[PDB]
Structure 1
């Protein structure tokens, strides 16, 4: 598999210099929506453990927004984005990111465990207000961050263990078809459908020799809109060469060959 992730995406809003009572955290698991939390309750897009933690994080972010200077008239947003991953090697990543009016200005991850800001003049200035905010608080040690990292990963592990995340492959269904029968030639399209995960290889082959990307025509990979994807590739051949053309597919470590049906 590609890695198991968990993301918290917390947003607080200021209108004409005043921090709004409300905030929203949207939890996503392996990319998929999982929780939405307002000030009051967490709901599945019982959740006490999540409501307790995520409400706290919310309040803590209303204050940090307050310590930002020159809050220009109107609406601005501050977000705290936390993503940890557990890979197939059981190695782990974690990142904390702060975004003001949706632009990064500050980033902590587990490999450096140092804060690092962009070059953007506005960024350096926003990071300033916020790190000077964290300096003052006698109770914001390097541990506070090393704990936020550890927390993310403990939750992700809790969610894995209790089978909230399913890591099931769906191998594609394949149909080949004849089409655009015109001027003694025909189009042969090989469609792959219903499949997860996304990555897939799908080419036409004349006599086991795979065809140049320029001699074929490729569908995009579209969401089927039930969690899965679909795609296709076609090529133009002379009528009665159809028994020398096969569609080759690699997916979820199957390899398979589909010929032009008669």
Structure 2
């Protein structure tokens, strides 16, 4: 079981209208813990364990870390935009960066740039350079590559700074982050003369990864018999999922829903 910390940045330019837009987000183990605006310029919390005043030692550098990235993102946005000869046009820039720590503390990092919703530049730490996903990204690639110092600092963040911040977060996170709540499983139905639609829902659970499948006569049904689950979020930090099965009216009883989740001690089987 590995752990992750990654930030997401997004902003847009304006059609000849100076300035832009902006917003950043921080996720640890796919759990959103921090939000940042440019319009308000305030760093809000997104979980109880990582609060402004509650253990505000980290909220200090974390609030610095983002303001810094904001500046860098702005510089980068301009660099990329100007290297496309883009001005009176409206464009977007998205960045994703973070690190993935393994059970053994061996880290893997990444830093990717998305321009106008498409892959553009991707940091390759191992070779201390960037991969241009498309021709128009090379001018920027060459700029960033003129002095290896940039790549060196970047890699240093991904392999040192980031993991250290992950560990520190995994700290004030224990008890809530690793906390898993199992799903409430319900099998509803919609009956008509020609067919009965079975619906199996897994509710208010967390983490999001879950397993849902139909059983015919207490036995597994080929995966290709029902579309895979659909997983959706609830605004409260929990998730829900559902699967569907169309069967001949009368046969309902032969079908059962089986749901598996780490929060459950063993697979849970629900009747129609």
Match of 1:166 in 2: 177
In 2 relative to 1, CA 58–203 (structure 1 residues): closer, same or farther, beyond 3 Å? same
Matching residue of 2:55: none
Residue-by-residue CA offset, 1:32-73 (whole Å, 9 max, x unaligned): 432214384322254331232322333344445555443433
Alignment CA distance shift 1:247-1:78 (3 Å): closer
- In the other structure, the counterpart of 2:6 is 6
Separation in 1, partners of 2:229, 2:113: 38
Distance 2:177 2:213 in 1: 26
Aligned-residue offset at 1:161: 0.8
Instruction: Between 228-237 and 69-78, report the one with greater CA deviation.
Output: 69-78
Distance 1:23-1:187 versus aligned 2 partners, 3 A rule: closer
Aligned twin of 2:68:
56
The correspondence for 2:99, drawn from 84, 87, 92, is: 84
How far apart, CA to CA, are the structure 2 residues paired with 1:71 and 1:99?
15
Tell whether the 8 Å contact from 2:15 to 2:87 is kept in structure 1 after alignment: no
Give the whole-Å Cα distance in 2 for the aligned partners of 1:21 and 1:72. 12
Residue range with higher mean Cα deviation, 1-10 or 212-221: 212-221
1:126 maps to 140
The one-character-per-residue Cα deviations of 1:159-213 (angstroms, maximum 9, x if unpaired) are: 1111176122222222345651637x8655443323332331221222x332345
**TM-score normalised by structure 1 residue count:** 0.73
Equivalent position of 1:93 in the other structure: 108
With normalisation by structure 2, the TM-score equals 0.71
RMSD of aligned Cα (Å):
3.7
More strand by percentage: 1
Rounded to whole Å, the distance in 2 between the matches of 1:99 and 1:258 is: 43
Residue 246 of structure 1 and its aligned partner are, at CA, apart by 3.4
1:155 matched to 2:165: yes
Distance 2:225 2:64 in 1: 58
Taking the TM superposition and a 5 Å limit, the aligned residue runs for 1:98-113 are 98-110=113-125, 112-113=126-127
Shift of 1:122: 0.6
The answer as to 2:24 corresponding to 1:25 is yes
* Structure 1: gaps of 5 or more residues: none
The equivalent of 2:56 in structure 1 is: none
Corresponding residue of 1:194: 204
| 1:145 and 2:160 correspond | no
Cα distance in 2 for partners of 1:163, 1:143 equals: 30
The alpha-carbon deviation at position 231 of structure 1 amounts to 0.8
Residue 81 to residue 212, structure 1, CA distance change in 2 (3 Å): closer
Paired residues of 2:36 and 2:66 also in contact (CA < 8 A): no
**Which of the pair has more CA radius of gyration?**
1
Q: What is the alpha-carbon distance in structure 1 between the residues aligned to residue 9 and residue 97 of structure 2?
A: 7
Residues 202, 224 of structure 1: alpha-carbon distance in 2 compared, 3 angstrom cutoff: farther
Q: Size of the alignment, in residue pairs?
A: 250
SS at match of 1:232: strand
| Per-residue Cα deviation, 1:203-257 (whole angstroms, up to 9, x for no partner) | 1222x33234565577633334432113133342463x66654333332262233
Aligned to 2:266: 254
